[PDB]
Amino acid sequence: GSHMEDFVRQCFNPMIVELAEKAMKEYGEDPKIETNKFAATCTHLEVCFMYSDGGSKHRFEIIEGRDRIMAWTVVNSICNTTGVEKPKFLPDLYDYKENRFIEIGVTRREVHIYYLEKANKIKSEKTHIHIFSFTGEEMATKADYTLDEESRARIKTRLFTIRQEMASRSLWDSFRQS
Ligand SMILES: C[C@H](C[C@@H](C[C@H](C[C@@H](C[C@@H](CCN1CCCC1=O)N1CCCC1=O)N1CCCC1=O)N1CCCC1=O)N1CCCC1=O)N1CCCC1=O
Ligand SMILES: [Mn+2]
Numbered sequence: 001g002s003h004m005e006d007f008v009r010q011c012f013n014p015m016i017v018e019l020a021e022k023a024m025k026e027y028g029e030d031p032k033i034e035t036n037k038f039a040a041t042c043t044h045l046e047v048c049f050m051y052s053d054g055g056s057k058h059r060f061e062i063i064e065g066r067d068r069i070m071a072w073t074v075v076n077s078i079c080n081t082t083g084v085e086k087p088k089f090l091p092d093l094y095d096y097k098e099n100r101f102i103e104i105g106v107t108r109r110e111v112h113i114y115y116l117e118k119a120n121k122i123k124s125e126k127t128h129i130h131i132f133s134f135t136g137e138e139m140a141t142k143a144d145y146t147l148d149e150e151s152r153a154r155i156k157t158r159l160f161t162i163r164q165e166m167a168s169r170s171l172w173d174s175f176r177q178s
């Protein structure tokens with residue numbers, strides 16, 4: 001293994017690592033080689049999970065972290081029972097409160113740039129978007145941030161802590177270049 005893989009293993013909890021490996025292998029990437037993508041997958045998974053935790057008990061359905069076939073199955077059930085249009089790309093969550101899918105992004109650039117990229121990619125219009133960065137900023141569709149301030153603040157703090165740990169291991173720089 002590499003230093004990035006050992007860091008990933010000591011940084012994220014093991015269930016997150018396992019789901020990241022699964023998701024990456026399902027697309028033919030090897031966690032032990034494409035280690036930057038491994039860290040990014042772990043970070044994105046943890047953010048999705050903290051986010052779904054931020055709501056009320058029954059509020060969100062978690063799409064991310066399932067195998068692709070089961071993810072689309074759950075998306076189909078949500079669409080067929082709520083009547084919301086089927087997105088073109090797998091979202092990360094479904095909000096039963098606001099009645100909408102959510103795409104979550106975690107970026108090492110400007111939340112503006114990544115938001116524009118994702119919103120050009122989606123084009124299905126009704127899928128809410130919520131971007132976080134590793135510097136503490138966030139941006140969301142209709143400036144509607146879904147959760148209260150405190151849950152988003154916890155996510156932002158975690159992102160900055162991951163950033164610092166990577167820097168202490170001199171892995172932040174190459175990570176920030178992908
Ligand atoms: C005990 C607790 C663990 C965390 C786990 C949770 C993430 C998420 C995990 C799985 C489990 C469902 N599976 C397993 C395989 C098949 C399948 O469908 N997936 C993936 C797809 C959807 C889903 O549900 N969920 C959500 C509900 C319960 C659960 O497990 N969350 C949420 C916060 C951050 C985090 O990691 N939980 C559980 C709820 C409270 C909590 O924090 N611990 C131990 C100490 C640290 C810690 O967080
Ligand atoms: Mn996703």
Ligand SMILES: [Mn+2]
Nearest residue numbers: 092103104105
């Ligand atoms: Mn996402």
